[PDB]
């Protein structure tokens, strides 16, 4: 956006943690090339306690399933809007998880850890909890 610095820094922060950037036309590429993974569409925060909230718990969350190589793809600001448009999302920025070329769900959980696990649990293994 006008004067990129906050989101710019934020993106670069998580980027340096080893999360590869994804483009709109490359989302489809990534989807078919990856065995499993999650895509973060980041437009603007709804409020957040702070700003980025600190996504460390997200990394350890996915890692309890080592059988799945979780390719975390983060998108550019203008790309998130385009990717969301192409998929049919509203606007709400969050972690969308995709597996087997299909849609698992979206991680609306952020703060509660025990609940966050349960949410991903329901998305990776459904029927047994899918509270959303």
UniProtKB/Swiss-Prot annotation:
Recorded GO MF terms: signal sequence binding
InterPro entries per the UniProt record, alphabetical: NiFe-hyd_mat_HyaE, Thioredoxin-like_sf
Superkingdom: Bacteria
Function in brief: Not known. Could form, along with HyaD, a complex involved in the processing of the hydrogenase 1 structural operon.
Protein family membership: Belongs to the HupG/HyaE family.
Protein name, UniProt field: Hydrogenase-1 operon protein HyaE
Species whose genome carries this gene: Escherichia coli (strain K12)
Gene name of the record: hyaE
């Amino acid at each position: 956006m006008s004067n990129d610095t906050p989101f710019d820094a934020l993106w670069q922060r998580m980027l340096a943690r080893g999360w590869t950037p994804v483009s709109e036309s490359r989302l489809d590429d990534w989807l078919t090339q990856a065995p499993d993974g999650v895509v973060l569409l980041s437009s603007d925060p709804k409020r957040t306690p702070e700003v980025s909230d600190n996504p460390v718990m997200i990394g350890e969350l996915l890692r309890e399933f080592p059988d799945y190589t979780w390719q975390v793809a983060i998108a550019d600001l203008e790309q998130s809007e385009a990717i969301g448009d192409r998929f049919g999302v509203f606007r709400f920025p969050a972690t969308l998880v995709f597996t087997g070329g299909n849609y698992r769900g979206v991680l609306n959980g952020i703060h509660p850890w025990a609940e966050l696990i349960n949410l991903m649990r329901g998305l990776v293994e459904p029927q047994q909890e899918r509270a959303s």
